[PDB]
Write a protein that binds this ligand. Sequence first.
Ligand SMILES: Nc1nc2c(ncn2[C@@H]2O[C@H](COP(=O)(O)OP(=O)(O)NP(=O)(O)O)[C@@H](O)[C@H]2O)c(=O)[nH]1
Ligand SMILES: [Mg+2]
Length: 166
Amino acid sequence: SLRELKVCLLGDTGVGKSSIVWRFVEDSFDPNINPTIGASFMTKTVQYQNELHKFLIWDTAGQERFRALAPMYYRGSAAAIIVYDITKEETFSTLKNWVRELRQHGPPSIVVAIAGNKCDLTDVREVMERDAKDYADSIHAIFVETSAKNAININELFIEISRRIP
Ligand SMILES: Nc1nc2c(ncn2[C@@H]2O[C@H](COP(=O)(O)OP(=O)(O)NP(=O)(O)O)[C@@H](O)[C@H]2O)c(=O)[nH]1
Ligand SMILES: [Mg+2]
């Protein structure tokens, strides 16, 4: 048996959406990765208990000219991963806007996950873990501080999704 799970990544440009997906699927990291144009699609199948979860992963362009396309991506998604950058408070401040948009226009029972990415960059941290954790908890979302660079909580993010899908 095999279970298809559409997952979309949402967030401001530069937060590491593509790097998260590349690390999960291709097990690689590129400091020189270019901004996404349109969307990138990758897939990985993982054993969860007695089933196989085939993640159909939509890596969306964060650049504002692509925002209008977002509804196309979250439609039919089993989960949404909203990514911010722990070194830029602006991307966290903005988190509520992404959540709002997913509340207002997304599927009724989507699994929401919040990823605080670039957690390897601790010296220049701007978003305290506790504050982002508190927020994720308040909306009953999955939360992890991730690093695509160091492979911190990348698999764990998708494991939490596997646990919480119906
Ligand atoms: N140190 C560190 N750098 C990271 C991490 N994830 C991504 N980066 C870097 O951050 C920059 C932006 O990454 P990228 O994956 O392109 O972000 P994005 O959210 O996909 N941007 P876009 O929306 O424009 O496609 C790149 O220089 C990349 O190497 C991380 O976990 N740690
Ligand atoms: Mg990208």
